[PDB]
Amino acid sequence: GVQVETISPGDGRTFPKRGQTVVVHYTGMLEDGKKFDSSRDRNKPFKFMLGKQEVIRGWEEGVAQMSVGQRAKLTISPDYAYGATGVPGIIPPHATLVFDVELLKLE
């Protein structure tokens, strides 16, 4: 599944709902800390719609548990990420992923 650990608290009040657009900064890392992706490197917040399944399952369910302003560490099992196949060249098979996610606003 996905484990959500707070880095810095949000408002504790505004949680994203299905159909809402979520605006975040994130960094994605393998288990050894190797970064494979980061919106912060692009200096461009990333937007996705909750429930569209345009992000991995661990994000769908993990970010849904975050409040606006919150920064959290999401630890995501492979079945909630890229599974047995992984993404060859980037993500190994059966990889646990760690994401640093900051929820900036809802749209």
Numbering used by the authors: 1 to 107
What does the literature reporting this entry say, word for word?
The immunophilin FKBP12 (FK506-binding protein of 12 kDa) was first characterized for its role in binding the immunosuppressants FK506 and rapamycin. The FK506-bound FKBP12 forms a ternary complex with calcineurin that inhibits the protein phosphatase activity of that enzyme which, in turn, blocks a key T-cell activation pathway involved in tissue transplant rejection. In complex with rapamycin, FKBP12 binds to and inhibits the protein kinase mTOR (mammalian target of rapamycin). Biochemical isolation of the RyR (ryanodine receptor) Ca2+ channels from skeletal muscle demonstrated that four molecules of FKBP12 are bound to each tetrameric RyR1 receptor.
Since these hydrogen exchange measurements utilize mildly basic conditions for extended time periods, we substituted valine for Cys22 of wild-type FKBP12 to circumvent the chemical modifications that can occur at cysteine residues under such conditions. We found that substitution of valine at position 87 dramatically suppresses the minor state of the slow exchange transition. Given the 12% population of the minor state in wild-type FKBP12, the H87V substitution shifts the equilibrium of the slow exchange transition at least 60-fold or by more than 10 kJ/mol. To gain further structural insight into how the H87V substitution so dramatically alters the dynamical properties of the protein, we carried out a crystallographic analysis of this variant protein at 1.70 Å resolution (crystallographic summary). Beyond the changes in covalent structure caused by substitution of valine for histidine at residue 87, there is strikingly little alteration within this region of the protein. The Cγ1 atom of Val87 lies upon the histidine Cγ atom of the wild-type structure, while the valine Cγ2 projects toward the face of the aromatic ring of Tyr82 which is not displaced but appears to become more constrained. Of the nine aromatic phenylalanine, tyrosine and tryptophan residues in FKBP12, the ring atoms of Tyr82 have the highest average crystallographic B-factor in the wild-type structure, but the lowest average B-factor in the H87V structure. This rigidification of the Tyr82 side-chain mobility is consistent with the reduced conformational dynamics of the Tyr82 backbone that is indicated by the marked narrowing of the amide resonance of this residue in the H87V NMR spectra. The H87V mutation appears to lock the protein in a conformation closely similar to the major form of wild-type FKBP12. The peptidylprolyl isomerase activity of FKBP12 is unaffected by the substitution of valine at position 87.
